[PDB]
């Protein structure tokens, strides 16, 4: 709010609108790359560019609401940020599964995970001044139940990949093949 002027314009809402636009663009560009498990050089570059743009937008919103400023808190609460974030959840839940099946996309997977971390810290910065019955909490649970499927998929992904650091190097896999650097016939790994 440009207090002192007469035709104040909201920059927070404009940033949210651009984020929603780029989110719809990301979702469409992914829907184009459905069924075909091949990501060419252009499909990598034009995707990483927009990944960086969206990451910068999320960092800008995080800096907007970093301090416990209830003004921008309510501004992001009563806006179209939830649609953008549920679209991002939907695209993440499928891109994380698609990029892990084949190699030559680890850079894309790493950038996507970084973007997801920035998005989650952004939406977490919305609750630093929370109340036991605040409106931001209600909006957040609402956007969660609206996209319960995608968040449950990413939760299964995280659980499957977190139950591996301890399941291997604690009891038997560390002594299965004690020669040197990690080599496995990929058949003993299956039974392990």
Which value, in Å, is the radius of gyration of the alpha carbons in the chain? 21
In 3D space, the residue among 102, 53, 75, 88 whose CA is nearest the CA of residue 8 turns out to be 75
Q: What residues contact residue 27 under an 8 Å CB cut-off, 6+ apart?
A: 87, 90, 91
Resolution of the coordinates, Å? 3.5
How far, rounded to the nearest angstrom, does the alpha carbon of residue 105 sit from its chain's CA centroid? Answer: 17
The number of beta carbons lying within 10 Å of the beta carbon of residue 72 is 19
Q: Which long-range contacts (CB under 8 A, 24 or more apart) does 51-56 make?
A: 51/26, 51/111, 51/112, 51/115, 52/111, 53/22, 54/19, 54/22, 54/23, 54/26, 54/88, 54/115, 55/114, 55/115, 55/118
Return the number of other C-beta atoms located less than 10 Å from residue 114's C-beta. 13
Beta bridge partners of 5: 3
Q: Cα(1)–Cα(25) distance, rounded to whole angstroms? A: 29
What is the rounded distance in angstroms from the CA atom of residue 182 to the CA atom of residue 192? 15
């Amino acid at each position: 709010t440009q207090t002192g002027n007469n035709t104040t314009v909201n920059i927070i809402i404009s940033t949210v609108d651009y984020l929603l636009r780029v989110q719809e663009s990301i979702s469409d560009f992914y829907w184009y790359y459905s069924g075909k498990d091949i990501i060419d050089e252009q499909g990598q570059r034009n995707f990483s560019k927009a990944i960086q743009v969206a990451k910068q937008v999320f960092n800008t919103l995080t800096e907007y609401i970093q301090g416990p400023c209830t003004g921008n808190q309510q501004s992001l609460a009563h806006s179209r940020l939830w649609d953008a974030v549920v679209g991002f959840l939907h695209v993440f839940a499928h891109m994380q599964m698609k990029l892990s099946q084949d190699s030559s996309q680890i850079e894309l997977l790493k950038e996507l995970m970084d973007l997801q971390k920035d998005m989650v810290v952004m939406l977490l910065s919305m609750l630093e001044g929370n109340v036991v019955n605040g409106t931001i909490g209600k909006q957040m649970v609402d956007m969660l139940v609206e996209s319960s499927n995608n968040v449950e998929m990413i939760l299964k992904f995280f659980d499957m990949f977190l139950k591996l650091k301890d399941l291997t190097s604690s009891d038997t896999f560390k002594e299965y093949d004690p020669d040197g650097k990690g080599v496995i016939s990929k058949r003993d790994f299956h039974k392990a």
